């Protein structure tokens, strides 16, 4: 944010009269009351509202994005899935929650219990780091599930991901379309004149 602020001797309240005479009182000669040497005087080099942001080349920022995406690929922590990446919550619960029979206290108490036991079977929960789900759009089940059970992981939208978010959890669970759009938006250094970007080797057996 960088909004911290402090008052200098030129902003502190009060009059700019001289405190004690130049000579005659025997004490150290003093000027105005807003000097830093006084009790309520201003801080000379105090913080001020300024901009802390720096610059990073688009090409260097894109290389850092594909380096964090490859650091996960070689370690097996990049698990891409198909589209429609949402938590497969039971149908009965969804029918009751949508209907309104279930109160909030029970609707939330269940999502927390199910998401915890679902992530533990997959070895994807708090006992094994955590997981980050990156999807193109916001899905109710997923984003709502990881809002009540946050110890098991989190969910993010493709536009809400940074280079620091890929490196902050145990695993990255990303969608096929999300990845194709994630590497296609950060290949500035590559696309300057193409390379394989989503080339299909084995097709889904419909």
């Amino acid at each position: 944010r960088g909004m911290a602020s402090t008052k200098t001797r030129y902003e502190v309240h009060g009059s700019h009269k001289k405190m004690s005479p130049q000579k005659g009182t025997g004490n150290a000669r003093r000027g105005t009351r807003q000097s830093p040497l006084m009790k309520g005087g201003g801080k000379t080099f105090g913080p001020k509202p300024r901009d802390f942001s720096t610059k990073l080349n688009k090409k260097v920022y894109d290389l850092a994005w594909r380096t964090a995406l490859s650091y996960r690929y070689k370690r097996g922590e990049l698990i891409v899935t198909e589209d429609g990446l949402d938590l497969p919550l039971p149908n009965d619960f969804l029918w009751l929650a949508g209907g309104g029979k279930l109160s909030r206290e029970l609707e939330d108490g269940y999502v927390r219990k199910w998401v915890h036991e679902f992530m533990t079977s997959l070895n994807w929960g708090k006992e094994a780091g955590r997981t980050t789900f990156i999807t193109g759009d916001k899905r109710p089940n997923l984003f709502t599930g990881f809002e009540l059970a946050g110890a098991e992981g989190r969910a993010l939208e493709l536009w809400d991901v940074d280079v620091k978010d890929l490196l902050e959890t145990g695993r990255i669970v990303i969608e096929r379309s999300a990845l194709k759009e994630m590497i296609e938006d950060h290949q500035s250094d590559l696309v300057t004149r193409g390379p394989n970007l989503g080339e299909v080797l084995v097709r889904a057996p419909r």
Binding site: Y71, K164, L167, E168
Partner: protein
């Protein structure tokens, strides 16, 4: 352990921070590298100050003036023009115009007051092309024609060169005709285009008109001259003989 707790810049990128006024052992302690009670310790000296002695620019004076009317050409050589064609970045079969010289990158990413074709590497240039620039050196005009090409020097400004890249103006190697026997054909063309295109300006001053009026520069106004006529709008070729 964690990756975010194991990142750092190369050691060669970090440098010592000198905080003055923080103890004797630091090496920048009391005086803070200022000396002892001078003007450089108490206040600030004017940078232009030399102690009182007059500077040399006042003892000699400033020499010359800065020409504020000279055109800022975008220099282009033949050694570099041949490299773009061998790489396939400039089509030699089509006319090479400022729109295609600025969008290819040969002259850079800055559009200046014109484009001048120079003659560096004129010995290894053997590609027949049809180039159009604002100027051309004597060695670049005959080097382009020795290979079997054609060159024409047109008049451009900084604004007209920008409209050519933006497509707001169509390129043409001919000046606007003059007379009542051309309105019917020129106005015909404007309607057909079905767009608001701007026109390329023609020279107006004496020097500008004369530069593109002589065949030495291959000016696009050279067709207005007779073989015995001179390019200058004031001087004339005297006649040789006894009379």
């Amino acid at each position: 352990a964690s990756i975010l707790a194991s990142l750092s810049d190369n050691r060669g990128a970090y440098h010592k921070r000198i905080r003055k006024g923080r103890g004797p052992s630091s090496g920048y302690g009391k005086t803070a590298g200022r000396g002892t009670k001078g003007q450089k310790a108490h206040g600030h000296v004017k940078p232009w100050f030399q102690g009182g002695q007059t500077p040399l620019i006042v003892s000699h004076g400033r020499k010359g003036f800065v020409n504020q009317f000279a055109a800022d050409m975008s220099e282009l050589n033949l050694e570099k023009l041949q490299e773009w064609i061998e790489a396939g970045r400039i089509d030699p079969t089509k006319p090479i115009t400022p729109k295609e010289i600025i969008k290819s990158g040969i002259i850079g990413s800055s559009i200046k007051d014109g484009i001048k074709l120079l003659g560096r590497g004129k010995e290894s240039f053997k590609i027949p092309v049809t180039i159009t620039v604002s100027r051309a050196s004597a060695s670049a005009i005959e080097a382009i024609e020795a290979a079997g090409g054609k060159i024409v020097t047109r008049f451009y400004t900084k604004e007209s060169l920008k409209r050519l890249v933006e497509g707001k103006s169509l390129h043409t190697d001919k000046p606007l005709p003059v007379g009542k026997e051309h309105v019917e054909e020129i106005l015909a063309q404007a309607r057909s285009l079905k767009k608001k295109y701007y026109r390329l300006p023609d020279p107006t001053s004496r020097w500008d008109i004369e530069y593109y009026r002589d065949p030495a520069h291959r000016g696009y106004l050279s067709h207005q001259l007779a073989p015995g006529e001179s390019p200058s709008l004031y001087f004339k070729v005297p006649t040789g003989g006894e009379k």
